[PDB]
Design a protein around this nucleic acid. Structure first.
Ligand code: MG
Ligand code: MG
Ligand code: MG
Ligand code: MG
Ligand code: MG
Ligand code: MG
Ligand code: MG
Ligand code: MG
Lengths: 128, 109, 236, 225, 125
RNA sequence: AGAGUGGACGGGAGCGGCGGCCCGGAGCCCCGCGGACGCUACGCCGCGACGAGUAGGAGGGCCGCUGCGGUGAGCCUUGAAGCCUAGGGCGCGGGCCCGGGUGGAGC
RNA sequence: CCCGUCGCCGCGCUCUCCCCCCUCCCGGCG
């Protein structure tokens, strides 16, 4: 029913959880997004057992499946019909996503042009 | 009509003293208390069967509340029965001490 | 077109050496020194249209996809399943009594006929004993016991193959949308050829089963585990 | 041009095929010769000892020229002299064996790094298992699996070493090009000893592993490769 | 010069679109619409591009003339083709290959023409 | 059709192999008109070894903030910024995109 | 040219002629 990608390998993620910041559960003033703990006694920086893990490059994902959505495609942000015309070749490897600022009539036009141009659209129903 | 599976017990996870590895399970099968008796069970399928709230689809039947985590016995763990098994998802820790079925599937006898 | 002239003793290794095989093939005398269509022409269909039309076959694609896939590499193993070597465990010889473990006929005791050409075992319960017809069953999912029925000189019909046993489909002819339902074909019909094949093979197996004592009661019964016996100690 | 050109390239392909057949026959015969040499050496040693027993004397065989050494302790808390000797032996990791040629200089530096290595005298089966299973060569500073006599010949053919059998023969019968063959060989990365060690940190003659077990290194090599 | 002009517009151009990990170009004679030296529609002595026609039927193939290289009014010759699919693919293939007019964009022009044709043909329900 | 681990011709002077009444001596492709992807060279691909880290140093950042020159025939009262989110995702990460709500003029 | 069942390595058969042993649409079948 939908538009299939060219190939669809099994995407393997080394880690699905996020890397939360140390003591961000203990405070509200500490936001969840990651800061590297510098601090002379700090036990997650020292990598003690059973602690918060720190991100490193060994968690990096396979470059064949990097940035790939859970249905075989890679996203491209589109604002209008000309930017859809640039996506004609990719087709089986790149899908479009209409930006959040595009109004109702213009995204109607974009979804119609993508339908006749066989480009996959991630958010086709956004003002209806 | 009749049981057709051997009864084992989830004894715990594979572990040292202060580190546990939840991808391997330790199983105590009833009746076997040496390695050269564990040799029979060495590739058999095994199942943790349990019930929950919602209904799940049953192969060849109508939906009910039973759920199964499948696995298989991989090798022996130490001198007195006690095999170690590998399940598709790691077993929940509320299953420790409970019943696990060893299913006589793929057969070599 | 001769036979192999070099019998194997361990696979990959012939028994006779290179010079011995030269001598056995007698290559000392038979040394040898030296030595569509794509287009057709259909007729004219004139007049004033003269010249027979040269027409090619397998024309160019009228469409090319916007990106293609590169072809694989070559792997040299990897034969399809129809060409695999079918192996059988040594304890299952024709006439052995097996125990079906997994199907709707869980824990049942049947006899073993020929093994089919796809590795699957053709068994029958003598259907008037335990309601098991001629079926296929997997070698990994039977347990082989040690009781025998000598089934030499039992006529097996040649039309008893995997194509004979392969499932049948009817859904769906010519219809794309479904709101009405097809309430037929869920009743799997036992065909008359299946019934008469069952009648023939049971009529030539069952008097041999009535010969040995207690075997028909044994085959009527089912296999089970109780509070005592453990399968690693059971002798089958 | 499209006929003389194609018959020329066909002649070239034929000549290359014939050269390949010649080199294959050569390496076959060489291996047969080494099989003769090995069995001759084995029976010769047995005959010598048996002759001395018949005469009533003693036969002292030649103390061996080849040793297999294995670094068996880790890299934490090592003396600088021990460190330098181990990296001159090319033992930079744990369970990291190699072949050494035994003389006074080599024996004294083994005596320096005694409590860090287990070493001994390998037999022909151990040299076969080591070069065939865990055989890697050093080809312009890379570690390449020995899958090809072409690889061996392109690195060591200037010494007459053109096959894995030539390599094994040099290493076992320590030739004049043993240094080049042993340096071509990347240091063997063995697995952990299957079955254990019974004590890592003491000498073999007092119940441990370190030092010179003489021919029990073959037992260790079977368990370890 | 093509190499000099590419070293100029390689990262600074009004046709360049850098968004999430991808790079595209929007100049009007760019098969495959990518930022590349091969598929650049402005810097080469010879360029071939294909577009949909003015009316919604057919494909216009525009090739760059040799002579008027500094006069952009006359520098492009475009022809509309409103045949069927196999003949339009055969005609643009014959054009590129038999003219020997930059014969490495041949298959890219083929893919683009087939995509434009399939989009032009009416949609089924 | 690009083809060279030596190719040149050209008299020079003889063979092996195809054409006999013993005399020989070019095929410039085609029944077809055709033949995937690639090479932002600051790109792409291959192989081998390696990966602790305070103080500190250096590199990369299509991480983030505000304003300026350009550029997007960019976005926006058919709803911008901001804010909320048991919604869908990406990225090792810094962070980001989309959906829903709220909001009411810019981004 | 519908679509590289290919390299190296290990083999088997044919472009020679004889045999002999189970067979076979077998042709009539005892
Ligand atoms: Mg993530
Ligand atoms: Mg917080
Ligand atoms: Mg400290
Ligand atoms: Mg220590
Ligand atoms: Mg062990
Ligand atoms: Mg110590
Ligand atoms: Mg580091
Ligand atoms: Mg909003």
């Amino acid at each position: 029913a939908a538009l299939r990608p060219l190939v669809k390998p099994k995407i393997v993620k080394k880690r699905t959880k996020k890397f939360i910041r140390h003591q961000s559960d203990r405070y509200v003033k500490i936001k969840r997004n990651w800061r590297k703990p510098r601090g002379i006694d700090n036990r997650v920086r020292r990598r003690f057992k059973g602690q918060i893990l720190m991100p490193n490059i060994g968690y990096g994902s396979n470059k064949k499946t990097k940035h790939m959505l859970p249905s075989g495609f890679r996203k491209f942000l589109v604002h209008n019909v000309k930017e859809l015309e640039v996506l004609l070749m990719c087709n089986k490897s790149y899908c479009a996503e209409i930006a959040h600022n595009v109004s109702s009539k213009n995204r109607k036009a974009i979804v119609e042009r993508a339908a006749q141009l066989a480009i996959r659209v991630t958010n086709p129903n956004a003002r209806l | 009509s009749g049981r057709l599976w051997s009864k084992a017990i989830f004894a715990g996870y594979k572990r040292g003293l202060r580190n546990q590895r939840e991808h391997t399970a330790l199983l105590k099968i009833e009746g076997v208390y040496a390695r050269d008796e564990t040799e029979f069970y060495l590739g058999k399928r095994c199942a943790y069967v349990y019930k929950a709230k919602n209904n799940t689809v049953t192969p060849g039947g109508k939906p009910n509340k039973t759920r199964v985590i499948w696995g298989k016995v991989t090798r022996a763990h130490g001198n007195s029965g006690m095999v170690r098994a590998k399940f598709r998802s790691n077993l929940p820790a509320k299953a420790i001490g409970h019943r696990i079925r060893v299913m006589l599937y793929p057969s070599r006898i | 077109p001769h036979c192999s002239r070099n019998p194997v003793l361990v696979r990959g290794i012939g028994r006779y050496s290179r010079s011995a095989m030269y001598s056995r093939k007698a290559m000392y005398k038979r040394k040898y020194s030296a030595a569509v269509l794509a287009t057709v022409t259909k007729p004219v269909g004139g007049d004033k249209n003269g010249g027979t039309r040269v027409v090619k076959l397998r024309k160019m694609p009228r469409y090319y996809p916007t990106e293609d896939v590169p072809r694989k590499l070559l792997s040299h193993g990897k034969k399809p399943f129809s060409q695999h070597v079918r192996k059988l465990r040594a304890s299952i010889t024709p006439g052995t009594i097996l125990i079906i473990l997994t199907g709707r006929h869980r824990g049942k005791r049947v006899v073993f006929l020929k093994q089919l050409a796809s590795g699957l075992l053709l068994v029958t319960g003598p259907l008037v004993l335990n309601r098991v017809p001629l079926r296929r069953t997997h070698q990994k999912f039977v347990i082989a016991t040690s009781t025998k029925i000598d089934i030499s000189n039992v006529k097996i019909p040649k039309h008893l193959t995997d194509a004979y046993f392969k499932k049948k489909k009817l859904r769906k002819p010519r219809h794309q949308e479904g709101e009405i339902f097809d309430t037929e074909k869920e009743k799997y019909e036992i065909t008359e050829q299946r019934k008469i094949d069952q009648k023939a093979v049971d009529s030539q197996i069952l008097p041999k089963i009535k010969a040995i004592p207690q075997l028909q009661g044994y085959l009527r019964s089912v296999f089970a585990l109780t509070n005592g016996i453990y399968p690693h100690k059971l002798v089958f | 041009n499209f006929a003389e050109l194609k018959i020329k390239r066909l002649r070239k392909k034929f000549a290359q095929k014939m050269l390949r057949k010649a080199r294959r026959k050569l390496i076959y015969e060489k291996a047969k010769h080494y099989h003769k040499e090995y069995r001759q050496m084995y029976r010769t040693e047995i005959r010598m000892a048996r002759m001395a027993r018949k005469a009533g004397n003693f036969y002292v065989p030649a103390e061996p020229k080849l040793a297999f050494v294995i670094r068996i302790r880790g890299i934490n808390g090592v003396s600088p002299k021990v460190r330098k000797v181990l990296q001159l032996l090319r033992l930079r990791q744990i369970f990291n064996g190699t072949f050494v040629k035994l003389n006074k200089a080599s024996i004294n530096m083994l005596r320096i790094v005694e409590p860090y290595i287990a070493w001994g005298y390998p037999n022909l089966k151990s040299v076969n298992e080591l070069i065939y299973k865990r055989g890697y060569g050093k080809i312009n500073k890379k570690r390449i699996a020995l899958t090809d006599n072409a690889l061996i010949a392109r690195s060591l053919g200037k010494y007459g070493i053109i096959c894995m059998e030539d390599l094994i023969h040099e290493i076992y019968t320590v030739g004049k090009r043993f240094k080049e063959a042993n340096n071509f060989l990347w240091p063997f990365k063995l697995s952990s000893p299957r079955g254990g060690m019974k004590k890592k940190t003491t000498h073999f003659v007092e119940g441990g592993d370190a030092g010179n077990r003489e021919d029990q290194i073959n037992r260790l090599i079977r368990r370890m490769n | 010069s093509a190499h000099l002009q590419w070293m100029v517009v390689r990262n600074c151009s009004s046709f360049l679109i850098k968004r999430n990990k991808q790079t595209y170009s929007t100049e009007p004679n760019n098969l495959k619409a990518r930022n590349s030296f091969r598929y650049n529609g402005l810097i080469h002595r010879k360029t071939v591009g294909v577009e949909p026609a003015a009316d919604g039927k057919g494909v216009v193939v525009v090739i760059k003339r040799r002579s008027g290289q500094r006069k952009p009014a006359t520098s492009y010759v475009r022809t509309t083709i409103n045949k069927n699919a196999r003949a339009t693919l055969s005609s643009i293939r014959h054009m590129i290959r038999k003219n020997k007019y930059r014969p490495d964009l041949r298959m890219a022009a083929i893919r683009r023409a087939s995509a434009i044709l399939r989009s032009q043909k009416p949609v089924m329900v």
